[PDB]
C-alpha cells in the first residue's frame, strides 16, 4: 500500500532488460510509465429516476479515487440526451494508486475475463500509449456478484513516456501484459 | 414585469424588472435609500 | 387604354440610418479632456496612453493634449494623447 511488486519489479527487473533489449543511455530517455485512465460511458441518466451515481462509486472501489461525472459537450436528437448534464464517468490514477490497480488488474481481472486469450497487440498500433475496454464490472476482486445490479464495463487507457509502440509494447509485455499475438 | 423596490417601512422605489414564471417572486436586494444610507428594498 | 398588370414582390424596401463612425480626431489635433476620438464598430482602435473607451468602444481623451496614433501589428492599432508644456 505504498510500494508494490509491479512498481518494484518495473525498476529492479524491467528497466535493465529494457535498457539492454532496446539500448538507452539516460534513465529518462527510458520507457517510464505514469498515467492510467479508467473511464466509463454508461449509457444515460434518462427517465425512471436514473441516478446512476451507483456504478459511480462501484467504480471507486475497483480503483481508489472518485470518478468525475462527465457531461455532454453537444446535443444529439438522434439518441436522446442533449445539451448538458447527462453522464460519462472518468478517473485518473497516477503514481501509487495506479501501480497497484494495474497489478490487481494483471493478476485477477483479465484472467478472470469471461474467456480470455490475451490482448490486442494492434491496439497501440504504433502511437505511443495503449488502450482497452472491459465489458464486465464484476471482474474485480473488490466487487461482488450479489453487489452489481447490472452489467456495464467500460474502457481504460494507459500512458507511456516512450514513443514507438515497439518500446511501449515491450514495457508492457514485461509488466505482464498478456498478448493474443 | 415592471418591478420596483419598496424599502421596508418607508418609501422610495428602484423601478426594476423581473421575469415571473422564469424563477421569480420574493424579489429584494440591498439598494441605497434617499432617507439616510443602507436598506434591502422588497418587491411590490 | 392598352393597360398592363404589374405588381411588386418588393420585400426589400429597408435600411437603418447612418451612424457616422470613424476617427473623429486625427493625429496631431490638440484636444481637451472628454473629446471622443473614435466611433467604432468593434475595437478597431485600441485605447492608448491617456485614452479610455466606454460601452460602445467609443475612445475618448482623458487629458488635454495632442493625439498620436500607432501601429502594433499583431498587437493592434492604438490611439493616445501626449500632454505638453
Amino acid at each position: 500500500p505504498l510500494d508494490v511488486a509491479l512498481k518494484r519489479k518495473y525498476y529492479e527487473e524491467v528497466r535493465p532488460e529494457l535498457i539492454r533489449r532496446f539500448g538507452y543511455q539516460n534513465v529518462w530517455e527510458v520507457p517510464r510509465l505514469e498515467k492510467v485512465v479508467i473511464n466509463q460511458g454508461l449509457g444515460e441518466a434518462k427517465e425512471d429516476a436514473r441516478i446512476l451515481e451507483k456504478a459511480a462509486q462501484e467504480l471507486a472501489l475497483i480503483t481508489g479515487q472518485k470518478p468525475a461525472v462527465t457531461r455532454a459537450k453537444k446535443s444529439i436528437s438522434n439518441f436522446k440526451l442533449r445539451k448538458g448534464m447527462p453522464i460519462g464517468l472518468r478517473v485518473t490514477l497516477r503514481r501509487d494508486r495506479m501501480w497497484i490497480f494495474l497489478e490487481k488488474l494483471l493478476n485477477v481481472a483479465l484472467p478472470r475475463i469471461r474467456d480470455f486469450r490475451g490482448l490486442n497487440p494492434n491496439s497501440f498500433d504504433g502511437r505511443g500509449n495503449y488502450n482497452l475496454g472491459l465489458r464486465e464490472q464484476l471482474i474485480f476482486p473488490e466487487i461482488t456478484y450479489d453487489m452489481v445490479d447490472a452489467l456495464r464495463g467500460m474502457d481504460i487507457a494507459v500512458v507511456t513516456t516512450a514513443e514507438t509502440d515497439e518500446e511501449a509494447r515491450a514495457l508492457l509485455e514485461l509488466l505482464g501484459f498478456p498478448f493474443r499475438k | 414585469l415592471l418591478l420596483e423596490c419598496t424599502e421596508c417601512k418607508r418609501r422610495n422605489y428602484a423601478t426594476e424588472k423581473n421575469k415571473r414564471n422564469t424563477p421569480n417572486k420574493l424579489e429584494l436586494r440591498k439598494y441605497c435609500p434617499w432617507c439616510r444610507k443602507h436598506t434591502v428594498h422588497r418587491e411590490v | 387604354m392598352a393597360h398592363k398588370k404589374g405588381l411588386g414582390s418588393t420585400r426589400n424596401g429597408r435600411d437603418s440610418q447612418a451612424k457616422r463612425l470613424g476617427v473623429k480626431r486625427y493625429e496631431g489635433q490638440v484636444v481637451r479632456a472628454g473629446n471622443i476620438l473614435v466611433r467604432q464598430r468593434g475595437t478597431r482602435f485600441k485605447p492608448g496612453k491617456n485614452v479610455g473607451m466606454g460601452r460602445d468602444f467609443t475612445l475618448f481623451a482623458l487629458v488635454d493634449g495632442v493625439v498620436e496614433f500607432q501601429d502594433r501589428g499583431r498587437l493592434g492599432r492604438y490611439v493616445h494623447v501626449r500632454p505638453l508644456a
Binding site: - | - | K4, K5, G6, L7, G8, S9, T10, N12
Partner: protein, 136 residues
C-alpha cells in the same frame, strides 16, 4: 448552380483581363471586343465545334457564365426583374481566350474555331502558341 444571386448589371471597362494565353489545347480563339456571352451562345458554339469534326479531339472552354441576366415580363416598373428567365452569362473583355482546341490538324483545328466565331456575338481572332510561358 449556387450562392445568393440576382446581381447588378455592372460594366466592362478596358479589357485589363482581355488577353490570357493558350493554356491547354494547341490553337485558340481570343476575343476582340467586350461583351456578355449567354450560355446559350457558348454551347451553340462549342456544339458546332465538336460537331465540325465528329469523333475528334478535345475542346476547352475557358470562359464560363455565372452572371444572372434579369429581365422584365413586358410591363412597367416595380422592383427588380423576374430576373434570369433566359438565364446567365459570362463577361468577356477584349483579349480573353474563350475556346481552344487540340489533338488535331491546323487545317481541321483552325477551320473549326472559325465557325464558332460566327456563333459568338463578337469579333474574334485565332492564335497558335509557342509564346508566353515561364521557362528558361
Amino acid at each position: 448552380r449556387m450562392k445568393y444571386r440576382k446581381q447588378q448589371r455592372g460594366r466592362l471597362k478596358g479589357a485589363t483581363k482581355g488577353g490570357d494565353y493558350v493554356a491547354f489545347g494547341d490553337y485558340g480563339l481570343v476575343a476582340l471586343e467586350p461583351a456578355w456571352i449567354t450560355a446559350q451562345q457558348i454551347e451553340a458554339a462549342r456544339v458546332a465545334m465538336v460537331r465540325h469534326f465528329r469523333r475528334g479531339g478535345k475542346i476547352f472552354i475557358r470562359i464560363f457564365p455565372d452572371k444572372p441576366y434579369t429581365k422584365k415580363p413586358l410591363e412597367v416598373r416595380m422592383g427588380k426583374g423576374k430576373g434570369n428567365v433566359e438565364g446567365y452569362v459570362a463577361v468577356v473583355k477584349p483579349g480573353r481566350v474563350m475556346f481552344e482546341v487540340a489533338g488535331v490538324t491546323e487545317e481541321q483545328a483552325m477551320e473549326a474555331l472559325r465557325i464558332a466565331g460566327h456563333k459568338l456575338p463578337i469579333k474574334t481572332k485565332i492564335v497558335r502558341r509557342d509564346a508566353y510561358d515561364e521557362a528558361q
